[PDB]
Design an enzyme around this catalytic site. Structure first.
Site, PDB file in Angstrom:
ATOM      1  CG  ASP A  25     -47.544  23.719 -40.685  1.00 43.56           C
ATOM      2  OD1 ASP A  25     -46.645  22.903 -40.389  1.00 43.56           O
ATOM      3  OD2 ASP A  25     -47.573  24.313 -41.770  1.00 43.56           O
ATOM      4  CB  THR A  26     -45.439  20.972 -35.545  1.00 43.40           C
ATOM      5  OG1 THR A  26     -45.216  19.913 -36.490  1.00 43.40           O
ATOM      6  CG2 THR A  26     -46.594  20.582 -34.629  1.00 43.40           C
ATOM      7  N   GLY A  27     -44.496  22.655 -38.356  1.00 47.37           N
ATOM      8  CA  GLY A  27     -43.393  23.130 -39.185  1.00 47.37           C
ATOM      9  C   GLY A  27     -43.449  24.614 -39.540  1.00 47.37           C
TER      10      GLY A  27
HETATM   11  C1  LIG Z   1     -43.425  19.824 -47.346  1.00 47.16           C
HETATM   12  C2  LIG Z   1     -44.878  19.807 -47.777  1.00 47.16           C
HETATM   13  C3  LIG Z   1     -45.463  18.625 -48.451  1.00 47.16           C
HETATM   14  O1  LIG Z   1     -44.712  17.520 -48.679  1.00 47.16           O
HETATM   15  C4  LIG Z   1     -46.799  18.646 -48.839  1.00 47.16           C
HETATM   16  C5  LIG Z   1     -47.607  19.763 -48.617  1.00 47.16           C
HETATM   17  C6  LIG Z   1     -47.106  20.903 -47.993  1.00 47.16           C
HETATM   18  C7  LIG Z   1     -45.775  20.971 -47.572  1.00 47.16           C
HETATM   19  C8  LIG Z   1     -45.290  22.214 -46.906  1.00 47.16           C
HETATM   20  O2  LIG Z   1     -44.349  22.825 -47.389  1.00 47.16           O
HETATM   21  N1  LIG Z   1     -45.948  22.587 -45.808  1.00 47.16           N
HETATM   22  C9  LIG Z   1     -45.672  23.798 -45.065  1.00 47.16           C
HETATM   23  C10 LIG Z   1     -46.979  24.518 -44.731  1.00 47.16           C
HETATM   24  S1  LIG Z   1     -47.569  25.386 -46.150  1.00 47.16           S
HETATM   25  C11 LIG Z   1     -48.641  24.337 -46.962  1.00 47.16           C
HETATM   26  C12 LIG Z   1     -48.878  24.489 -48.330  1.00 47.16           C
HETATM   27  C13 LIG Z   1     -49.755  23.627 -48.993  1.00 47.16           C
HETATM   28  C14 LIG Z   1     -50.402  22.607 -48.296  1.00 47.16           C
HETATM   29  C15 LIG Z   1     -50.167  22.444 -46.930  1.00 47.16           C
HETATM   30  C16 LIG Z   1     -49.295  23.311 -46.268  1.00 47.16           C
HETATM   31  C17 LIG Z   1     -44.851  23.402 -43.841  1.00 47.16           C
HETATM   32  O3  LIG Z   1     -45.619  22.614 -42.909  1.00 47.16           O
HETATM   33  C18 LIG Z   1     -44.223  24.608 -43.144  1.00 47.16           C
HETATM   34  N2  LIG Z   1     -42.940  24.959 -43.784  1.00 47.16           N
HETATM   35  C19 LIG Z   1     -41.865  24.071 -43.281  1.00 47.16           C
HETATM   36  C20 LIG Z   1     -40.511  24.389 -43.931  1.00 47.16           C
HETATM   37  C21 LIG Z   1     -40.479  23.908 -45.389  1.00 47.16           C
HETATM   38  C22 LIG Z   1     -39.159  24.280 -46.063  1.00 47.16           C
HETATM   39  C23 LIG Z   1     -38.914  25.787 -46.004  1.00 47.16           C
HETATM   40  C24 LIG Z   1     -38.886  26.263 -44.551  1.00 47.16           C
HETATM   41  C25 LIG Z   1     -40.156  25.875 -43.784  1.00 47.16           C
HETATM   42  C26 LIG Z   1     -41.307  26.786 -44.209  1.00 47.16           C
HETATM   43  C27 LIG Z   1     -42.623  26.383 -43.542  1.00 47.16           C
HETATM   44  C28 LIG Z   1     -43.678  27.274 -44.125  1.00 47.16           C
HETATM   45  O4  LIG Z   1     -44.037  27.130 -45.288  1.00 47.16           O
HETATM   46  N3  LIG Z   1     -44.126  28.191 -43.274  1.00 47.16           N
HETATM   47  C29 LIG Z   1     -45.038  29.295 -43.541  1.00 47.16           C
HETATM   48  C30 LIG Z   1     -45.062  30.192 -42.307  1.00 47.16           C
HETATM   49  C31 LIG Z   1     -44.552  30.133 -44.714  1.00 47.16           C
HETATM   50  C32 LIG Z   1     -46.425  28.730 -43.792  1.00 47.16           C
END
Ligand SMILES: Cc1c(O)cccc1C(=O)N[C@@H](CSc1ccccc1)[C@H](O)CN1C[C@H]2CCCC[C@H]2C[C@H]1C(=O)NC(C)(C)C
Lengths: 99, 99
Positions: A25-27
């Site tokens: 997860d690069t985000g």
């Molecule tokens: C944007 C998005 C979609 O369109 C579909 C599915 C998931 C996501 C999503 O939010 N994915 C996240 C992983 S957490 C995750 C949760 C469920 C499934 C997969 C990943 C991002 O890649 C990371 N995400 C990017 C970013 C999103 C907006 C808020 C600030 C960061 C927070 C960060 C994040 O949550 N980081 C943690 C350390 C808390 C895990």
């Protein structure tokens, strides 16, 4: 190893003697794992994503095998629905984005 | 173009005539941008991450320029604290993880 992104980039990890699937997860700044027990002390922490925050336990200097590459870093444990490998560990395995 | 992960992978995007910074996010299925207006119809949508869910407006067939690569995909608009480029668009610019 190159991994395209047509499907979720899920890899096998080994941590605390256990085998798990996790998302590269690069985000994510940090690596966050679903509930499990780990060694040493831990600290209470909060991490925010989209939608809100979760309470997590922070463990330091944890050995993790990620797609058969060894790394030692900080791992967060808490109510995440997916095991997340964040940049803290991605850098340690020499992971880059390329296009 | 290779991008290492020691820093958040933030790139410049152009969308709806506007220039923005966005995070290359292999952990996101979808691309999500902070409030803005876009052309055509939109459909109500809810997306979840860590911590909870947010309500977003879904826009289809939107032209986006990402690191100077053109793509046409579905863009979600809502209360995200960071502009997120997800796999839907990452695949369109030929982006891969390599280690
Ligand atoms: C944007 C998005 C979609 O369109 C579909 C599915 C998931 C996501 C999503 O939010 N994915 C996240 C992983 S957490 C995750 C949760 C469920 C499934 C997969 C990943 C991002 O890649 C990371 N995400 C990017 C970013 C999103 C907006 C808020 C600030 C960061 C927070 C960060 C994040 O949550 N980081 C943690 C350390 C808390 C895990």
């Amino acid at each position: 190893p190159q991994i395209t992104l047509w499907q979720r980039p899920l890899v096998t990890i080994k941590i605390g003697g256990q085998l798990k699937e996790a998302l590269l997860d690069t985000g994510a700044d940090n690596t966050v794992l679903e509930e499990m027990s780990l060694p040493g002390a831990w600290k209470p922490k909060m991490i925010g994503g989209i939608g809100g925050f979760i309470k997590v336990r922070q463990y330091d200097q944890i050995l993790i095998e990620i797609c058969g590459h060894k790394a030692i870093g900080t791992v967060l444990v808490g109510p995440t629905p997916v095991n997340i490998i964040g940049r803290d560990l991605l850098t340690q395995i020499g992971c880059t984005l390329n296009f």
